[PDB]
Design an enzyme around this catalytic site. Structure first.
Site, PDB file in Angstrom:
ATOM      1  N   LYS A 114       0.796  -1.219   0.000  1.00 43.85           N
ATOM      2  CA  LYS A 114       0.000   0.000   0.000  1.00 43.85           C
ATOM      3  C   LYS A 114       0.842   1.290   0.000  1.00 43.85           C
ATOM      4  CE  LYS A 114      -3.508  -0.346   2.901  1.00 43.85           C
ATOM      5  NZ  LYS A 114      -2.639  -1.223   3.726  1.00 43.85           N
TER       6      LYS A 114
ATOM      7  N   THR B 198       4.049   1.992  -0.164  1.00 43.45           N
ATOM      8  CA  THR B 198       5.036   2.053  -1.218  1.00 43.45           C
ATOM      9  C   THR B 198       4.334   2.605  -2.447  1.00 43.45           C
ATOM     10  OG1 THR B 198       6.106   0.088  -0.266  1.00 43.45           O
ATOM     11  CG2 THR B 198       6.845   0.764  -2.396  1.00 43.45           C
TER      12      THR B 198
ATOM     13  N   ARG C 264      -0.076   8.317   7.668  1.00 40.41           N
ATOM     14  CA  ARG C 264      -0.220   8.168   9.123  1.00 40.41           C
ATOM     15  C   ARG C 264       1.133   8.065   9.807  1.00 40.41           C
ATOM     16  NH1 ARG C 264      -2.439   2.545   8.687  1.00 40.41           N
ATOM     17  NH2 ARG C 264      -2.008   2.711   6.467  1.00 40.41           N
TER      18      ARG C 264
ATOM     19  N   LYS D 154       9.076  -5.052  13.743  1.00 40.85           N
ATOM     20  CA  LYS D 154       9.365  -4.105  12.650  1.00 40.85           C
ATOM     21  C   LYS D 154      10.468  -3.092  12.991  1.00 40.85           C
TER      22      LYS D 154
ATOM     23  N   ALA E 278      -7.180   0.566  12.504  1.00 37.08           N
ATOM     24  CA  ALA E 278      -8.189   0.484  11.439  1.00 37.08           C
ATOM     25  C   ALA E 278      -9.342  -0.491  11.784  1.00 37.08           C
ATOM     26  CB  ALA E 278      -7.542   0.140  10.059  1.00 37.08           C
TER      27      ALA E 278
ATOM     28  N   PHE F 237      -5.543  -1.363   6.491  1.00 37.82           N
ATOM     29  CA  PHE F 237      -6.121  -2.648   6.085  1.00 37.82           C
ATOM     30  C   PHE F 237      -6.573  -2.682   4.626  1.00 37.82           C
ATOM     31  CE2 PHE F 237      -7.311  -3.459  10.798  1.00 37.82           C
ATOM     32  CZ  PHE F 237      -6.012  -3.868  11.061  1.00 37.82           C
TER      33      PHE F 237
ATOM     34  N   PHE G  89       6.451  -8.118  -8.700  1.00 38.48           N
ATOM     35  CA  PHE G  89       7.461  -8.878  -7.995  1.00 38.48           C
ATOM     36  C   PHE G  89       8.286  -9.624  -9.018  1.00 38.48           C
ATOM     37  CE2 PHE G  89       7.409  -8.911  -3.366  1.00 38.48           C
ATOM     38  CZ  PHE G  89       6.244  -8.113  -3.076  1.00 38.48           C
TER      39      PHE G  89
ATOM     40  N   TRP H 236       8.734   0.490  -6.263  1.00 36.78           N
ATOM     41  CA  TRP H 236       9.658   0.048  -5.240  1.00 36.78           C
ATOM     42  C   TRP H 236      11.072   0.051  -5.794  1.00 36.78           C
ATOM     43  CZ3 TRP H 236      12.941  -4.206  -4.921  1.00 36.78           C
ATOM     44  CH2 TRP H 236      13.457  -4.475  -3.634  1.00 36.78           C
TER      45      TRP H 236
HETATM   46  N1  LIG Z   1       9.797  -5.974  -6.286  1.00 41.14           N
HETATM   47  C1  LIG Z   1       9.844  -6.090  -4.936  1.00 41.14           C
HETATM   48  N2  LIG Z   1      10.848  -6.788  -4.338  1.00 41.14           N
HETATM   49  C2  LIG Z   1      10.901  -6.914  -2.993  1.00 41.14           C
HETATM   50  N3  LIG Z   1       9.991  -6.356  -2.152  1.00 41.14           N
HETATM   51  C3  LIG Z   1       8.931  -5.620  -2.614  1.00 41.14           C
HETATM   52  C4  LIG Z   1       8.799  -5.447  -4.078  1.00 41.14           C
HETATM   53  N4  LIG Z   1       7.690  -4.710  -4.279  1.00 41.14           N
HETATM   54  C5  LIG Z   1       7.167  -4.426  -3.058  1.00 41.14           C
HETATM   55  N5  LIG Z   1       7.898  -4.956  -2.054  1.00 41.14           N
HETATM   56  C6  LIG Z   1       7.555  -4.856  -0.588  1.00 41.14           C
HETATM   57  O1  LIG Z   1       6.694  -3.755  -0.251  1.00 41.14           O
HETATM   58  C7  LIG Z   1       6.812  -3.583   1.168  1.00 41.14           C
HETATM   59  C8  LIG Z   1       6.346  -2.219   1.661  1.00 41.14           C
HETATM   60  O2  LIG Z   1       5.597  -2.290   2.877  1.00 41.14           O
HETATM   61  P1  LIG Z   1       4.753  -0.973   3.266  1.00 41.14           P
HETATM   62  O3  LIG Z   1       4.341  -0.326   1.966  1.00 41.14           O
HETATM   63  O4  LIG Z   1       5.469  -0.179   4.340  1.00 41.14           O
HETATM   64  O5  LIG Z   1       3.393  -1.521   3.903  1.00 41.14           O
HETATM   65  P2  LIG Z   1       2.188  -1.436   2.859  1.00 41.14           P
HETATM   66  O6  LIG Z   1       2.699  -2.214   1.677  1.00 41.14           O
HETATM   67  O7  LIG Z   1       1.749   0.003   2.717  1.00 41.14           O
HETATM   68  O8  LIG Z   1       1.072  -2.333   3.609  1.00 41.14           O
HETATM   69  P3  LIG Z   1       1.501  -3.727   4.310  1.00 41.14           P
HETATM   70  O9  LIG Z   1       1.196  -3.661   5.891  1.00 41.14           O
HETATM   71  O10 LIG Z   1       3.078  -3.947   4.080  1.00 41.14           O
HETATM   72  S1  LIG Z   1       0.483  -5.204   3.540  1.00 41.14           S
HETATM   73  C9  LIG Z   1       8.289  -3.756   1.430  1.00 41.14           C
HETATM   74  O11 LIG Z   1       8.463  -4.243   2.755  1.00 41.14           O
HETATM   75  C10 LIG Z   1       8.734  -4.764   0.387  1.00 41.14           C
HETATM   76  O12 LIG Z   1       8.945  -6.031   1.016  1.00 41.14           O
END
Ligand SMILES: Nc1ncnc2c1ncn2[C@@H]1O[C@H](COP(=O)(O)OP(=O)(O)OP(O)(O)=S)[C@@H](O)[C@H]1O
Ligand SMILES: Nc1ncnc2c1ncn2[C@@H]1O[C@H](COP(=O)(O)OP(=O)(O)OP(O)(O)=S)[C@@H](O)[C@H]1O
EC number: 6.3.4.3
Lengths: 549, 550
Positions: free
Chosen positions: B69, B71, B92, B103, B271, B299, B379, B405
């Protein structure tokens, strides 16, 4: 009209930082008027000369009020006026009291440290940082127990309580860990006011962020089943505890109503701990100023002895002067005049109550340090009352400070005597006791020579306590006496200079990050409570500004 | 790589970004060179100006496999700036506790981050301390009142107001307070919830200014008299003081993406037992400073997106313009039945089957009159066959791949372009899912039925009493805030995908009188998480100043 109503004319701290040769890059601002100074200022001025060190202290506290801080800022403004490079260091006030009884200014009248309201509240968050360092550790202790108790701790002997910066009585004695196997291990603990935290104490005696890191690791949390002490170290908590303190470590630059540069940083308890602002603040200050003025909590029997014997001992300080504050109102109370009767002139009472200050003076003598008395002048305090006193100090230097009312110009006379002291009256500073004496010998040396008791007694509980500590290897530490501030003795009722009395130590507590603590009574007031009509009830903030804080 | 990329970040002074947005120096309050609180005066003088477009980012039902999310939100924001857009992202503040347990996780993630990371993860501007202390001052006041002869006549056994701390401390879940005798308070059972779970925090997020937040506090119900009358914080004359402790916490904090795009971080509630959105104040200030504002919600879309629309938007008059819904191949496959371990292996069948989860969320967003765009968080293990089927599958909505990312804003360019395009051809017709004047039970069914796809809703005796009591105390025309599992549309966390022929069970219903009604399902009761066997706290250090791991 009160000291609040003097919220007026602050200069951006940043420029002050330049007026001291602190570089821009060593300043983390908090808006224009608060900032944090890096510990790099000390490390680059590592070997420069130190300015002179000027501990202000006070006579035995009384309901009459005296005025350490107020006189201390006033001492500072005055030195400013005389074109000297001069800083003050003060302690940060607990948030708790703002909502309870208190809610006061750093100093007072025309010798204050500003901005008043931030200082009393969340300042630069130094106390939240203490708070989390404490409670994190507490958490780790309990989690460990939840996690199988590898260290084999006895939950029943955890001496690490939790912390919060509010006057909250209902947290003194609590039971945690209820709810079953998912929810921790049941045990008895409590909270104490954050500023009372061993962690607040360590902040105040640390050399730097790595000295803090170590001291944390030395902390005892409780003991295992076969009496072996577990440590913060054992729990690998010290690293995390330090991280939380990454910023608390740096001292806070602020000012006087008269734009005089101030540090306020740290704020320990004055009995259970030593009650000085931090070592980082004062040793840093020494390199930026020719003349640093700092203070200690309570009367010189507690604060100052602990200043000398704890703070200076550790930091290699060599105090050059020491001011001692006294009022006429206060001494009369030491002569036996009630709080209701202070309005009346009483030259005979002030004469008898003087014995107090007379002892205090002899004690500053005992340290090889240049004493000087200062009287905070009062509206009731009369010319024959002042004259009676001025001459009564026929032994060591005296001056009157009209500071609370006249600013730097009113502590003009007072600062003269000090500067005359510092130029003509060299110091020979030496700690009262030696760190290789006996816990008892050490306590004894504080009791007789500083207080004047004939001797020291110990309870059953006090001896097996001492025993354990000597033989746990903690016997080589200094002694921080937890007693009532209202007397030289442990009997609070006994004002003035009480004679032919003894001191009884009921218990002994350890502070493994720092030193050894001998309590005299229920000094157990490590968490005071709100009053029937608390200030929270009347505190408010309209669509802009604050009433009654 | 190495997701402490936030080192080499190269940040612009915030002050510079602020005057860049048209903020005056006197509306800026520095916390170091790179952080600033910003006056509510900025909103006041810009009230009459028009809003920019509002873009919510949300995601599919969360999983062990992760989604992405934040990211994506940062990534979107940056992609938008690279396209020359005047944009802001609002996010947030993280709770401090997660930093020492598991974490200490990324600002946003990879090349999509808001920085200074370290301070965002720890004390930041101390907004959470203000919340902790406002909240505990109420508590301390409650207790002292009992202690002072109990004029208001509270049954201490009915006090719902707990205490709070920003650490994962399970031992504080159920405690007994006020022991030691007549001098030491009055014995009672309570506990501590994690600071960010505080209603004081939910209020901060939902307040319009300091006075409304001050007002909201006076309505906070703490307990009940021996007679059943509600007793409030106003009744304890505590709101002034709590307000005082929030004097600075009320201002949003200006910071930036790795690419120097301005960003607001302010507030961060739960949430489930709250609405999982950052503060109205930040968001509303961002609509006046920027042409576009990206924000997100806690969420999956069934909870956080729902609450963003039905609580936050309701109070603020926001009319969301688009919504970006984040999904991954790997999560969709979990939803189609694939176990966590076997996620790399190509499986178009479980992808197809798992898409039902994503399909539903799209459908739901539709129900608010806001057009959706899916973002595929790429990914390295995702085959072409896979990604491609995912597009064909998104038959209804704009789709794109986000490589945000790995490649910063540039990875977001495709997505950004799809959003701008939707912005221009497909204006929203926003409306909340439900009218306030339905009953609690009617409102819940709207949500359970329409958004979860539940058959209907069951209630225990305790639930029934609570709803009868709240309605007769007059709190029954308020919004409803479902606290359920996020790992499922149902309240069985094991029902992944798009479960059918199921039923929701409300077990217990609580009231937040700084807003609305909280109605729990399972043990979403988890308002104070714990530390694991090996906590990150143990392997954290600082040396020269090299903060190792966390
Ligand atoms: N190509 C990729 N390679 C490795 N990791 C990736 C890739 N794309 C996204 N990610 C992951 O994206 C995650 C980002 O987490 P956050 O964005 O902080 O939480 P969020 O994605 O907003 O919601 P949650 O709680 O993680 S489901 C990183 O921890 C990476 O592990
Ligand atoms: N010369 C004076 N005239 C009137 N009031 C005074 C004077 N000096 C101090 N006070 C008041 O005395 C109060 C505190 O006296 P004490 O608490 O004994 O001093 P302290 O504990 O060293 O801390 P302070 O406030 O800096 S003196 C302050 O609130 C001042 O307002």
């Amino acid at each position: 009209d009160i000291e609040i109503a003097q919220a007026a004319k602050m200069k951006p701290v940043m420029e002050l930082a330049r007026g001291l040769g602190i570089q821009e890059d060593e300043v983390e601002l908090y808006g224009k008027y608060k900032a944090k100074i890096s510990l790099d200022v000390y490390r680059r001025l590592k070997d420069k000369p130190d300015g002179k060190l000027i501990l202000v202290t006070a006579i035995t506290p009384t309901p009459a009020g005296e005025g350490k801080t107020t006189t201390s800022v006033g001492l500072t403004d005055a030195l400013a006026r005389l074109g000297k490079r001069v800083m003050v260091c003060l302690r940060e006030p607990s948030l708790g009291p703002s909502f309870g009884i208190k809610g006061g200014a750093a100093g007072g009248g025309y010798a204050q440290v500003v901005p008043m309201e931030d200082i009393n509240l969340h300042f630069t968050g130094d106390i939240h940082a203490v708070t989390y360092a404490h409670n994190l550790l507490a958490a780790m202790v309990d989690n460990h127990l939840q996690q199988g108790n590898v260290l084999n701790i006895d939950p029943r002997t955890i001496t690490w309580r939790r912390v919060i910066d509010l006057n909250d009585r209902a947290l003194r004695n609590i039971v945690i860990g209820l709810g079953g196997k998912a929810n921790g291990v049941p045990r008895e603990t409590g909270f104490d006011i954050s500023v009372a935290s061993e962690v607040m104490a360590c902040l105040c005696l640390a050399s730097d962020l790595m000295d803090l890191k170590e001291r944390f690791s030395r902390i005892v949390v409780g003991y295992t089943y076969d009496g072996k002490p577990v440590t913060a170290g054992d729990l690998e908590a010290q690293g995390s505890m330090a991280l939380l303190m990454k910023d608390a470590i740096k001292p806070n630059l602020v000012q006087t109503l008269e734009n005089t540069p101030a540090f306020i940083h740290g704020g320990p308890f004055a009995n259970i701990a030593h009650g000085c602002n931090s070592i980082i603040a004062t040793k840093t200050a020494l390199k930026l100023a020719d003349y640093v003025v700092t203070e200690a909590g309570f009367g010189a029997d507690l604060g100052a002895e602990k200043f000398y014997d704890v703070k200076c001992r550790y930091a290699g300080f060599k105090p050059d002067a020491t001011v001692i504050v006294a009022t006429v109102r206060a001494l009369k109370m030491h002569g036996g005049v009630p709080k209701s009767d202070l309005a009346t002139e009483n030259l005979e009472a002030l004469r008898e109550g003087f014995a107090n200050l007379e002892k205090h003076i002899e004690n500053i003598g005992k340290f090889g340090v240049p004493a000087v008395v200062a009287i905070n002048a009062f509206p009731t305090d009369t010319e024959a009352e002042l004259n009676l006193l001025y001459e009564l100090c026929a032994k060591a230097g005296a001056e009157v400070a009209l500071s609370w009312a006249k600013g730097g110009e009113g502590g003009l006379e007072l600062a003269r005597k000090v500067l005359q002291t510092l130029e003509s009256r060299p110091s020979n500073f030496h700690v009262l006791y030696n760190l290789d004496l006996s816990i008892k010998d050490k306590i004894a040396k504080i009791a007789t020579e500083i207080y004047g008791a004939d001797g020291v007694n110990y309870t059953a509980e006090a001896d097996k306590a001492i025993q354990r500590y000597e033989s746990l290897g903690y016997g080589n530490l200094p002694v921080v006496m937890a007693k009532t501030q209202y007397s030289f003795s442990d009997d609070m009722t006994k004002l003035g200079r009480p004679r032919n009395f003894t001191i009884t130590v009921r218990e002994v507590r350890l502070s493994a990050g720092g030193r050894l603590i001998v309590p005299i009574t229920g000094a157990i007031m490590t968490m005071p409570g709100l009053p029937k009509r608390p200030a929270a009830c009347n505190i408010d903030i309209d669509a802009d500004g604050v009433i009654t804080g």
